[PDB]
From a paper:
The hexameric, barrel-forming, AAA+ protease Lon is critical for maintaining [name] matrix protein homeostasis. A human Lon monomer contains a [name] targeting sequence, a Lon-associated N-terminal (LAN) domain, an α-helical neck region, an AAA+ domain, and a protease domain (PD) in a single chain. The LAN domains specifically recognize and capture fully or partially unfolded substrates, which are then threaded towards the barrel chamber for degradation using the chemical energy from ATP hydrolysis. We determined high-resolution structures of substrate-engaged, substrate-trapped, and substrate-free forms of the human [name] Lon protease.
To gain further insight into the regulatory mechanisms of Lon protease activity we determined the cryo-EM structure of a substrate-free form of Lon (Lon^Apo^). We employed a fortuitously stable, catalytically inactive Lon mutant (containing the mutations G106P, R563W, and K594M), which also displays no proteolytic activity and limited ATPase activity. The Lon^Apo^ has a right-handed helical arrangement with a rise of approximately 8 Å ([Fig fig4], Fig. S4C) and all protomers are ADP-bound. The catalytic S855 is in an α-helix preceded by a loop (residues 844– 852, [Fig fig4]) that functions as a gate controlling the accessibility to the catalytic site. In Lon^Apo^, this gate loop is in a closed conformation ([Fig fig4]). The C-terminal part of the loop forms a 3_10_ helical turn, thereby extending the S855-containing α-helix. The turn is stabilized by a salt bridge between K851 and D643 in the α-subdomain. The 3_10_ helical turn positions the key residue D852 to form a salt-bridge with the catalytic K898 ([Fig fig4] and Fig. S6B) and hinders the proteolytic activity.
Residue numbers in the entry:
A (entry chain D): 410 to 786, 796 to 949
B (entry chain E): 419 to 786, 796 to 949
C (entry chain C): 410 to 595
The structure:
């Protein structure tokens, strides 16, 4: 038995001796080694112990994938691989520079939050190869099992450690990049708290001395780059939110989308099929038509799909030889994907009395939502619709009151709000904290209705209003402004406090859009209803 | 040697061989007397039985594959079109290709049957698997071998039985996948829908990574919305349509009639069945887009016929319309539209339902200073709110058109809308609701045989509705004369084949003032 | 049997030899020892027996952590670590002083309620440095389960034990410092 036992033990010996192993691990392994020497071959413990040896030897103790320091080359890889993302490109360059001063490996915890299908997933995949790290994707989503992360108890025969340990078995690097997805969409279970398990990772101190239920050994993850993805910010748990730095990954306008589609989408779709450029050719105009009329998404997941289908119908044609070799033009695209889905961008051409087009940062991303009001024949009343939270209800009350207030101050001869029963509708999609954002918009509607002078054509406006008519800053100007542009707006009205955020945008985004900044509502009235 | 008999022929990857030889060496060291020896033998057998390097020879001969689909099923042009892309694409790859395709639609439309046909066309192994109301992950990810009565997942069982790494997986009824104590099964499903995990999928029993990419995954749904969000974004969608009587007629004749005869083994001459019989068999025995009803009825006639032939009391079976009662008795569904003449306050509506294209009515009534509305039904929050908008729109609208009438503004109204419509298609009846209240107002009913749909804004802009295809099928089946759709739904309407849209007086509207001028004469 | 059963038995005993273990504990573990020898090797219950036995011996008993209790050093450490917070400084140096005079260790419960990011937690670590006490952290925010502290019954399969014992298993000593946080959001 003893001769064969030595060979079993020696195969683990050769594995560990090539690693830079911590002192406690050898003491652990020798104890496990000593048991195996006495334990019989048929023993259940013997198998699990041998299993345990495989797990610990699989751990890359002091094995770093050499991270290369080249400002230009890091940029080059990111530049060719992805369009745009100035903020994230700069943050990743920054990560290089810091790591450079160390002259050693570096770890950190970041979030990529933005609308879906804008390339969050894709960017992180590029980082790993760019920085010569082994790439990994891991999913928390709505998973309730804490054991997925912290592992199961060792003593249970056949039990396995956490999947992050399993990652290091595969990747054979102590310096991986781990992408964790949809942390905003965290699950709740009786079995444990995944939130706390992840908080062991996000806490820098706990990160350096992470433990597993199977492994029973403090591992070091201080050099591991953790990458979070989210769609919205508020739904992330507070401890996770404040032990980590958030980066906004924006949606795309027409022009950006178009360069994405030409440079990446189209060759990815061609490489997916196996076609050649000589075989399938689209046009700039084709994609303009595809973007404008056959996609409503902030990102390009949906436009990716539409490009996809186009090449699929082209592929079929070539094999069969049904037509001449595919050149695609606006006139003949109908055969490939069909008739225009969206013929108009917004709910009206011209707003009738008492309807305002407002802006909203939805969970998905930017959109336009109209607001509309209505009359029913001693004190007046307001009725309100949508899945309005208690917060917005109150805000609307205040809006309603402000509206009333403003009417007396301006035109006291009129009596509209104050002796008539009024109903307005506010469409849903707006997040809890983004709900107050259309307060002043409500106001506009009630006043609009009063005189029966309609809001001047294709004017937008967003902001919160106080009870005496002072406008508050609103979040996510980036997203709301994208939205206005998509839905063909000409003139926009914003809080004076949001001036910073609007002028942080790119040239091609803000241009063609005559902006106004305002601080109080009396300014807005002079814009929306001139004479 | 017995294990080697599989390993020698079936070319095994590196990491797998490593587990196998370790297990095999362990088996040799372990005493045959021990129970754990048999555990190893069972484990080794599983590993050897699983195919390695036996990808099915993919017959990418497009011309032959075309014919196979066409003969097996009627219509289904869109679905076949997607499949025929698949071979063509696979040709440009020059190798096997793996993709995930969804057939949502009404029950008994042919999702399961078509799945069979693709398998035939591609010469792939047809494996059938069912989640339904699955609550446990162990069906997919297997049970850990350490526990008593442990068996690996059916996916793993599939590979063993099919002896190929290029099967076709049918995984039906994913839209209503269950949830339970052990967690969310949807997590395991995401492991199947992602090619990234397919290449390295592992089991709690198998304990070995396996590449199950390049496999055509087929799933069926009944409704789109109910499918989990992470699966839905990842998923590729295919609509599979309903059928009118004339379509259904052809299906019976070409397929169902001979299929029943084939299943019964009966000669065609023996048990003659005619077209006219089936015309009645549709109009009087079915009121849904599915052919489950028509299939059971043809079965019934032929099952009785089998008895008739064998016994010899009628050794020649011929069916005529006057002789149908002999096999099926009297007509089950005598009438089609449950109001022949709509009284005031009643209107005809349209809905999309899980069971398929549906036909529903909407009615309002009185109850006896401000008016009131009591919306009733198992109705959701959205529909309640929409109804308030509808009601408000009704109010708005009446002062505009005829201000002297104070009916709906002062009196108390009760409203009822039948259920079945998915939450998503719940608001679609919004437009009809208004029609009902105005109808109630002047007491002049809507013009006869008029069906109508659409969401309405508080100011009266109409909005587009989903699944118009199925809605129009149902309105034809219930025999409407005239149909009013939203102007932005004009896309869907002209997409339809001409034979369904024959004899429908369609009108397109943007705003409800148009509906009011159409539904009421002057 | 001496190869597997006795090996498990022995390794755990000479582990416990240096620990000042109460009488009631020996009787429990000795019964477990008798059980391990009695029970079949390959049974699931053996693994659970071996599981329970391991945890019993791993936990320290009467292994009291030592401290310098030089008060001058203690105050210096805390002043060097943080600015402000004289009140909490004052309280904790009173605690060492009280402990010192008693000529024995002391276990009391103290709480810092403060606005977020003010330094409650970082102070915790300063205390541990000053006090030579082992540190540990545990959160209760948004938490709704007794069983993560009180433990699951060792009879069950997939049983998850008490949190507190894991700390004691980590520390391998008594006289620990535990930070319990988000107590108001329980
Ligand atoms: N700036 C960009 N440069 C290159 N590709 C991009 C860019 N923005 C989006 N994409 C593409 O759009 C798609 C978005 O998919 P993905 O990143 O998986 O979505 P999500 O961001 O929701 O995780 C990818 O296929 C990616 O190639
Ligand atoms: N368009 C069609 N062409 C041919 N057969 C059809 C068609 N639609 C339905 N069938 C018949 O339906 C039968 C079973 O339908 P099935 O696949 O169970 O429907 P579903 O998947 O919707 O439940 C098949 O044996 C087939 O002959
Ligand atoms: N008195 C102090 N002197 C210096 N830094 C302090 C002081 N109090 C807090 N800090 C800083 O606070 C941070 C830690 O705050 P933390 O204890 O996590 O906040 P909280 O009290 O909400 O738990 C550190 O970056 C630390 O330097």
């Amino acid at each position: 038995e003893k001769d064969d036992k030595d060979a079993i033990e020696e195969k683990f010996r050769e594995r560990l001796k090539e690693l830079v192993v911590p002192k406690h691990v050898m003491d652990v392994v020798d104890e496990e080694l000593s048991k195996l020497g006495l334990l019989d071959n048929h023993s259940s413990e013997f198998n699990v112990t041998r299993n345990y040896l495989d797990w610990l030897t699989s751990i890359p103790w002091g094995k770093y994938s050499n991270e290369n320091l080249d400002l230009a080359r890091a940029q080059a890889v990111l530049e060719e691989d992805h369009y745009g993302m100035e903020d994230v490109k700069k943050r990743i360059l920054e990560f290089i520079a810091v790591s450079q001063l160390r002259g050693s490996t570096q770890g950190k915890i970041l979030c990529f939050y933005g609308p879906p299908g804008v390339g969050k997933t894709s960017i992180a995949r590029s980082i790993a190869r760019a920085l010569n790290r082994e790439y990994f994707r891991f999913s928390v989503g709505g998973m309730t099992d804490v054991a997925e992360i912290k592992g199961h108890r060792w003593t249970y025969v056949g039990a396995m450690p956490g999947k992050i340990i399993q990652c290091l078995k595969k990747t054979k690097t102590e310096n991986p990049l781990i992408l964790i997805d949809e942390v905003d969409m965290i699950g709740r279970g009786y079995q444990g708290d995944p939130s706390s398990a992840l908080l062991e990772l996000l806490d820098p101190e706990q990160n350096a001395n992470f433990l597993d239920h199977y492994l029973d050994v403090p591992v070091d993850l201080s050099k591991v780059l953790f990458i979070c993805t989210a769609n919205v910010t508020d739904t992330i748990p507070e401890p996770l939110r404040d032990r980590m730095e958030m980066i906004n990954v924006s949606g795309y306008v027409a022009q950006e989308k178009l360069a994405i589609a030409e440079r990446y989408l189209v060759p990815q779709a061609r490489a997916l099929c196996g076609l050649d450029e000589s075989k399938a050719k689209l046009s700039s105009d084709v994609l303009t038509l595809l973007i404008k009329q056959y996609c409503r998404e902030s990102g390009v997941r949906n436009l990716q799909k539409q490009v996809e289908k186009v090449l699929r119908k082209s592929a079929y044609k070539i094999v069969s030889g049904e037509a001449e070799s595919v050149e695609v033009t606006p006139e003949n695209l109908q055969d490939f994907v069909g008739k225009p889905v969206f013929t108009v961008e917004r709910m009206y051409d011209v707003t009738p009395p008492g309807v305002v087009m407002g802006l909203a940062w939805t969970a998905m991303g930017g959109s336009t939502l109209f607001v509309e009001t209505s009359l029913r024949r001693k004190d007046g009343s307001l009725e309100v619709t949508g899945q309005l939270g208690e917060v917005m209800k109150e805000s609307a009350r205040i809006a309603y009151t402000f509206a009333r207030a403003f009417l007396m101050q301006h035109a006291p001869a009129n009596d509209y709000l104050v002796t008539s029963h009024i109903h307005l509708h506010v469409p849903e999609g707006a997040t809890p904290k983004d709900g107050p954002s259309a307060g002043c918009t409500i106001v506009t509607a009630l006043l609009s209705l009063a005189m029966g002078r309609p809001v001047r054509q294709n004017l937008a406006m967003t902001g919160e209003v106080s009870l005496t008519g002072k406008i508050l800053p609103v979040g996510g100007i980036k997203e709301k402004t994208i939205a206005a542009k998509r839905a063909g707006v000409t003139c926009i009205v914003l809080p004076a406090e949001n001036k910073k955020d609007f002028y942080d945008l790119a040239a091609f985004i803000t241009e063609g859009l005559e902006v106004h900044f305002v601080e109080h509502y009396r300014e807005i009235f002079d814009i929306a209803f001139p004479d």
